[PDB]
Paper text:
The Yersinia outer protein J ([name]) family effectors are widely deployed through the type III secretion system by both plant and animal pathogens. Among them, [name] produced by the root-infecting bacterium [name] acetylates a conserved lysine residue in WRKY transcription factors to inhibit the expression of defense-related genes. Our recent studies identified a previously undescribed regulatory domain in the structures of [name] and HopZ1a. Both the binding pockets of InsP6 and the acetyl group donor acetyl-coenzyme A (AcCoA) are located on the interface between the regulatory domain and the catalytic core.
To understand how InsP6-binding induces the structural change of [name] effectors, we crystallized the entire acetyltransferase domain (residues 149–488) of [name] in the absence of InsP6. The apo-state [name] structural model consists of a five-stranded β-sheet sandwiched by αD, αE, and αF from one side and αC from the other side and a helix-bundle formed by the αB and αA from the very N-terminus and αG and αH from the very C-terminus. The catalytic triad, including His260, Asp279, and Cys321 residues, are well preserved in the structure. Structural comparison of the apo-[name] structure with that of the InsP6-bound [name] reveals that the catalytic core is well conserved, giving a root mean square deviation (RMSD) of 0.5 Å over the Cα atom of 248 aligned residues. The most striking difference lies in a segment ahead of the N-terminus of the regulatory domain (residues 351–375), which is able to adopt two entirely different structures with distinct sets of packing interactions. In the apo conformation, this segment exists as a long α-helix (αF) that is packed against αE and β5 mainly through hydrogen bonds and hydrophobic interactions; by contrast, in the [name]-InsP6 complex structure, the same set of residues are folded into two antiparallel β-strands (β6’ and β7’) linked by a long loop (Lβ6’β7’). Indeed, it is apparent that αF in apo-[name] would sterically clash with the first helix of the regulatory domain, which harbors R380 and K383 residues that directly interact with the phosphate groups of InsP6. The C-terminus of αG is too close to the Lβ8’β9’ of the regulatory domain and RRS1WRKY in the overlapped structures, suggesting that the stabilization of the regulatory domain by InsP6 leads to disruption of the C-terminal helical structure of αG to save room for substrate binding.
Author numbering: 146 to 282, 296 to 302, 305 to 371, 449 to 484
Write the structure that this text describes.
Amino acid sequence: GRQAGQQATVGRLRTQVTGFLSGALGKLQALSAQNMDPELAQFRVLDVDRAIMPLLIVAENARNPGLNLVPLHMDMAEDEEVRTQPPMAGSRHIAEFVASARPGRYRAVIDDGSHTRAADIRKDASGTSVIVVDPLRNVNMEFGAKCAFIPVDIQKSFFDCRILSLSLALKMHDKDDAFAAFHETLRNGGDPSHHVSRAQQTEELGATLVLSVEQKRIALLNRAASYVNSAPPPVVMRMAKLLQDSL
């Protein structure tokens, strides 16, 4: 009876998650009405995006084994007075992640309290390197374990950066080897032409990354919902917990 007694709870949570994603789709459809003020739509979509991003991340991690997307945030995202929005549910401070994460290859969306950016992270015994994609459409400034920023010809957008960062993370997964190469370059700090090579590669990476937000969001939601239908009980419990936490 407990195979059933537990199947009821799972079905319940599953229906919660499904109903939520469907509700989000509804809101998005209403916000894209001919009547709607687009600025108002952006403002409204802030909360929608914050709420659905964890679920999108879970789903997309399932659909693309190896993506290993993790939501991360920085110090300013923990300042209640300054941050525009609280970090999404399940978000971890980047420090804690660097210290605790199982070694390997990750994609990330990093929230700094204002904007979210895509990133590729590699944790070795050698150390950890973080490659941050930075939509700019600070010369010779480095930050920190090793971090490198790749300037890309993409409009920096407060309202679009979550979905855009998700998309870019997917593309980084698609260009896994290029980013691995840059990780090795970033690790090989010793080489005399490092500074050049790095910079060179930076440019190149940028290009490969740039080679609508609304449509992408819709598609991601559909994929997420259809995944939630067939999703296993652990995943269901997880997503449900994230959803509950977001409120």
